[PDB]
Amino acid sequence: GKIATKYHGDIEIHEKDIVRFEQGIPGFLEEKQFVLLQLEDTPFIILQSVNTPALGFVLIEPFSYFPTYEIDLDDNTLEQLQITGEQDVALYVILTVAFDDTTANLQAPIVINVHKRLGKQVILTNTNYKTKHRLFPEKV
Fold this sequence. Notes:
Elements: E1 2-3, E2 11-12, E3 19-20, E4 33-38, E5 45-49, E6 56-60, H1 75-80, E7 89-96, E8 103-104, E9 110-113, E10 118-121, E11 133-134
Antiparallel strand pairs: 1-2, 3-4, 4-5, 5-6, 6-7, 7-8, 7-9, 8-11, 9-10
PDB class: translation
Keywords: Translation, flagellum, assembly factor
Assembly: monomeric
């Protein structure tokens, strides 16, 4: 199919490219189909809705900015994403771009079972992670 996008103009996509979010994303419970679009030659990846051109979240791989970031997925999350055995899992965090005052949501990363093409925004428990971590400490 052919879709319009927030940052990429009109593009062709294939069913193979679509990541299904069976629960949508919080605040967007009805948005169950996304594609991942690199920007390009930047580290940013857009989580672009296949049904709503204006909905595109700005993602980064978190170790770009937070080298000590560490995540543990619980069983119920593995079951909801049907993650078993040798299947591969991709990990991202959503950026709120303010480039100076930007924050990343480390509490609630985007987790994708690439092989089953399923995703979810996972809410981490019993961590010190917050929904806004500054990319740049205020000291610089």
